[PDB]
């Protein structure tokens, strides 16, 4: 992976030049929000086991089909508790790697460890991609409930969850 810093330094190494001030201004924008990026992360560790629970009920309250028999399409939704146990486990990962990626200030950790082969894996097990992405942003609204009076923490929290949404899409447009 690469944080915002190492990604910035590779940006200037490829061109083989020292760090100018436009390069350093990008680093300073991380160092300013870096102290704010932690209690976002620290709130997630304190709210982790909860925030998955509100995401699941908010998901199945709109997708009751996911708790039902699959139809003859052998599809992996949360039908059985074996299916339900593993299916809650995926929400663990989406909250986790989107928690590191809040601290790195860059989605490099996301795609190489979550996105690479994600459509591969779900197409094998026939897993829902639609509801799978919707639960990713149910977490985003749920996390943004805590930091809401101001609006500069909101763009920070949105960046990891928004990146998984745009990338797991089969592109309609």
């Amino acid at each position: 992976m690469q944080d915002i810093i190492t990604s910035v330094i590779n940006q200037y190494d490829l061109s083989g030049r020292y760090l100018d001030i436009k390069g350093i201004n990008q680093i300073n924008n991380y160092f300013d929000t870096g102290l704010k990026r932690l209690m976002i992360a620290k709130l997630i560790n304190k709210e982790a086991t909860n925030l998955i629970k509100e995401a699941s009920e908010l998901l199945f309250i709109e997708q009751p089909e996911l708790l039902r028999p699959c139809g003859n399409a052998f599809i992996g939704n949360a039908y059985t508790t074996r299916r339900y146990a593993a299916c809650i486990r995926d929400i663990e990962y989406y909250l986790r790697y989107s928690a590191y990626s809040i601290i790195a200030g860059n989605n490099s950790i996301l795609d190489e460890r979550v996105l690479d082969g994600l459509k591969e894996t779900y197409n094998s097990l026939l897993v829902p991609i639609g509801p799978t992405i919707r639960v990713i942003q149910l977490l985003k609204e749920i996390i943004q409930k805590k930091f809401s009076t101001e609006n500069i923490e909101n763009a920070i929290i949105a960046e990891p969850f928004d990146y998984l949404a745009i990338n797991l899409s089969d592109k309609n447009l």
Binding site: K42, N45, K46, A48, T49
Partner: protein
Amino acid sequence: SLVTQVILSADDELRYPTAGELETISSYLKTGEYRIRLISILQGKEQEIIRLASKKIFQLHPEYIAPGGNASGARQRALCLRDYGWYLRLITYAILAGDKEPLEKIGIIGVREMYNSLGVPIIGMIDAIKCLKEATVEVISQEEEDFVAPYYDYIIQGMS
């Protein structure tokens, strides 16, 4: 501790500690006594805190106290405060050696199978630690309780 993690993590690569790691030891040792000053604050409030933990773990969960529950009876409740005492004692270790291993080599690794063979509901113990963290905020000011806050919720993350 933290130096032990650097010696170990540098030892499996067969190299001396790098520039960043020696920061991680140097910055940890410069914040030394403040953990030492903090643990003496908590040791003087162990009878403080576990009395407050038994406040809300049982008003939240009268299932365990009632006749039939695991904690019913005097001697069952007697060790009940002892488990709080060992956990609070473990957290003073974790607050000092600035990482999670004393909370992980003890207490966390294999805790569910310990409780499941005891009859203690593992979900109830999660609220017990969450109750214990709720109790530590009152006898501690705002400066230093967020220093000790991340050591508590690691235990909750470890127990799930």
